[PDB]
Amino acid sequence: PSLYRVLILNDDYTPAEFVVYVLERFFNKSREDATRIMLHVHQNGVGVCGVYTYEVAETKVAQVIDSARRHQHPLQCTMEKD
Amino acid sequence: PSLYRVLILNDDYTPAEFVVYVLERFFNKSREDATRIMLHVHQNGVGVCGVYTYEVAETKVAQVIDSARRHQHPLQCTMEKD
Ligand SMILES: [Mg+2]
Secondary structure: OOOEEEEEEOOOOOOHHHHHHHHHHHOOOOHHHHHHHHHHHHHHOEEEEEEEOHHHHHHHHHHHHHHHHHOOOOOEEEEEEO | OOOEEEEEEOOOOOOHHHHHHHHHHHHOOOHHHHHHHHHHHHHHOEEEEEEEOHHHHHHHHHHHHHHHHHOOOOOEEEEEEO
16 A cells, blocks of 8 residues: 655745644644654755555645645645655 | 655746756656656645665755756755655
8 A cells, every 4th residue: 555745845934833733733743753844844845744545645735734724824735655 | 774755846936947957857857757747846846856875866956956056046956765
Protein backbone atom coordinates (compact mmCIF):
# COMPACT_ATOMS: atom_id res chain seq x y z
CA PRO A 1 0.00 0.00 0.00
CA SER A 2 1.58 3.26 -1.20
CA LEU A 3 1.32 6.05 1.38
CA TYR A 4 1.21 9.83 0.98
CA ARG A 5 2.98 12.63 2.81
CA VAL A 6 1.14 15.81 3.74
CA LEU A 7 3.08 19.02 3.26
CA ILE A 8 2.66 22.60 4.40
CA LEU A 9 4.19 25.47 2.44
CA ASN A 10 5.72 28.62 3.83
CA ASP A 11 4.13 32.01 3.34
CA ASP A 12 4.75 35.50 4.76
CA TYR A 13 1.30 35.90 6.34
CA THR A 14 0.36 32.86 8.43
CA PRO A 15 1.48 33.28 12.06
CA ALA A 16 4.07 30.81 13.35
CA GLU A 17 1.85 29.95 16.32
CA PHE A 18 -1.02 28.98 14.03
CA VAL A 19 1.23 26.54 12.16
CA VAL A 20 2.28 25.00 15.49
CA TYR A 21 -1.41 24.82 16.43
CA VAL A 22 -2.27 23.04 13.17
CA LEU A 23 0.54 20.52 13.59
CA GLU A 24 -0.60 19.71 17.13
CA ARG A 25 -4.31 19.60 16.28
CA PHE A 26 -4.30 17.67 12.99
CA PHE A 27 -1.01 15.77 12.92
CA ASN A 28 -0.66 14.60 16.53
CA LYS A 29 2.65 16.43 16.93
CA SER A 30 4.28 17.03 20.29
CA ARG A 31 4.98 20.68 21.07
CA GLU A 32 8.67 20.18 20.31
CA ASP A 33 8.06 18.38 17.01
CA ALA A 34 5.44 20.93 15.96
CA THR A 35 7.85 23.78 16.68
CA ARG A 36 10.71 22.14 14.76
CA ILE A 37 8.53 21.42 11.72
CA MET A 38 7.16 24.97 11.76
CA LEU A 39 10.72 26.29 11.83
CA HIS A 40 11.70 23.91 9.03
CA VAL A 41 8.86 25.22 6.87
CA HIS A 42 9.93 28.78 7.61
CA GLN A 43 13.56 28.06 6.71
CA ASN A 44 13.19 25.67 3.79
CA GLY A 45 9.82 26.70 2.36
CA VAL A 46 8.08 23.36 2.87
CA GLY A 47 7.76 20.72 5.58
CA VAL A 48 6.38 17.22 6.15
CA CYS A 49 3.40 16.96 8.53
CA GLY A 50 2.65 13.24 8.41
CA VAL A 51 2.21 10.16 6.26
CA TYR A 52 -1.12 8.42 5.69
CA THR A 53 -3.12 6.37 3.21
CA TYR A 54 -4.22 8.40 0.16
CA GLU A 55 -7.74 9.14 1.36
CA VAL A 56 -6.63 10.05 4.88
CA ALA A 57 -3.92 12.36 3.50
CA GLU A 58 -6.65 14.01 1.40
CA THR A 59 -8.70 14.42 4.56
CA LYS A 60 -5.85 16.02 6.52
CA VAL A 61 -5.08 18.42 3.67
CA ALA A 62 -8.74 19.43 3.51
CA GLN A 63 -8.98 19.89 7.28
CA VAL A 64 -5.91 22.13 7.31
CA ILE A 65 -7.18 24.33 4.47
CA ASP A 66 -10.61 24.59 6.08
CA SER A 67 -9.08 25.53 9.43
CA ALA A 68 -6.61 27.98 7.90
CA ARG A 69 -9.17 29.91 5.88
CA ARG A 70 -11.63 30.08 8.79
CA HIS A 71 -8.72 31.49 10.80
CA GLN A 72 -8.15 34.07 8.05
CA HIS A 73 -4.79 32.65 6.94
CA PRO A 74 -3.63 31.72 3.40
CA LEU A 75 -1.66 28.67 4.59
CA GLN A 76 -1.10 26.21 1.71
CA CYS A 77 -1.31 22.47 2.31
CA THR A 78 -0.89 19.67 -0.22
CA MET A 79 0.22 16.03 -0.52
CA GLU A 80 2.67 13.88 -2.48
CA LYS A 81 3.27 10.15 -2.74
CA ASP A 82 5.62 9.26 0.08
CA PRO B 1 20.25 6.23 4.20
CA SER B 2 17.43 7.23 1.87
CA LEU B 3 17.33 8.60 -1.63
CA TYR B 4 16.25 12.24 -1.77
CA ARG B 5 13.60 14.03 -3.81
CA VAL B 6 14.38 17.43 -5.28
CA LEU B 7 11.53 19.93 -5.06
CA ILE B 8 10.75 23.24 -6.73
CA LEU B 9 8.50 25.65 -4.85
CA ASN B 10 6.05 28.13 -6.35
CA ASP B 11 6.61 31.88 -6.28
CA ASP B 12 4.95 34.90 -7.91
CA TYR B 13 7.95 35.97 -9.98
CA THR B 14 9.57 33.08 -11.86
CA PRO B 15 8.19 32.64 -15.38
CA ALA B 16 6.47 29.34 -16.12
CA GLU B 17 8.76 29.00 -19.13
CA PHE B 18 11.84 29.11 -16.91
CA VAL B 19 10.49 26.39 -14.63
CA VAL B 20 9.87 24.26 -17.73
CA TYR B 21 13.43 25.03 -18.88
CA VAL B 22 14.90 23.98 -15.54
CA LEU B 23 12.96 20.71 -15.56
CA GLU B 24 14.03 19.90 -19.12
CA ARG B 25 17.69 20.80 -18.62
CA PHE B 26 18.54 19.72 -15.08
CA PHE B 27 16.05 16.88 -14.63
CA ASN B 28 15.85 15.51 -18.17
CA LYS B 29 12.10 16.00 -18.42
CA SER B 30 10.33 15.89 -21.77
CA ARG B 31 8.49 19.07 -22.69
CA GLU B 32 5.14 17.57 -21.71
CA ASP B 33 6.44 16.15 -18.41
CA ALA B 34 8.13 19.45 -17.58
CA THR B 35 4.87 21.26 -18.32
CA ARG B 36 2.96 18.79 -16.13
CA ILE B 37 5.27 19.35 -13.17
CA MET B 38 5.32 23.11 -13.68
CA LEU B 39 1.51 23.17 -13.48
CA HIS B 40 1.70 21.16 -10.26
CA VAL B 41 4.09 23.79 -8.88
CA HIS B 42 1.63 26.52 -9.85
CA GLN B 43 -1.48 24.91 -8.40
CA ASN B 44 -0.17 22.94 -5.42
CA GLY B 45 2.80 25.12 -4.50
CA VAL B 46 5.46 22.47 -4.99
CA GLY B 47 6.53 19.91 -7.59
CA VAL B 48 8.82 16.87 -7.63
CA CYS B 49 11.76 17.14 -10.03
CA GLY B 50 13.57 13.85 -9.44
CA VAL B 51 14.93 11.38 -6.90
CA TYR B 52 18.67 10.85 -6.40
CA THR B 53 21.36 9.86 -3.94
CA TYR B 54 22.01 12.63 -1.40
CA GLU B 55 25.10 14.08 -3.07
CA VAL B 56 23.51 14.14 -6.52
CA ALA B 57 20.36 15.76 -5.12
CA GLU B 58 22.59 18.44 -3.57
CA THR B 59 24.19 18.94 -6.97
CA LYS B 60 20.84 19.33 -8.73
CA VAL B 61 19.54 21.77 -6.13
CA ALA B 62 22.72 23.83 -6.46
CA GLN B 63 22.59 23.84 -10.25
CA VAL B 64 18.97 25.03 -10.19
CA ILE B 65 19.65 27.85 -7.71
CA ASP B 66 22.73 28.93 -9.67
CA SER B 67 20.76 29.01 -12.92
CA ALA B 68 17.77 30.74 -11.36
CA ARG B 69 19.66 33.58 -9.69
CA ARG B 70 21.84 34.22 -12.74
CA HIS B 71 18.58 34.51 -14.71
CA GLN B 72 17.28 36.93 -12.03
CA HIS B 73 14.58 34.61 -10.69
CA PRO B 74 13.99 33.89 -6.98
CA LEU B 75 12.97 30.27 -7.67
CA GLN B 76 13.42 28.09 -4.58
CA CYS B 77 14.72 24.55 -4.96
CA THR B 78 15.22 22.23 -2.01
CA MET B 79 15.40 18.53 -1.13
CA GLU B 80 13.69 16.09 1.26
CA LYS B 81 14.22 12.43 2.14
CA ASP B 82 12.24 10.45 -0.40
MG1 LIG C 1 9.45 6.90 0.11
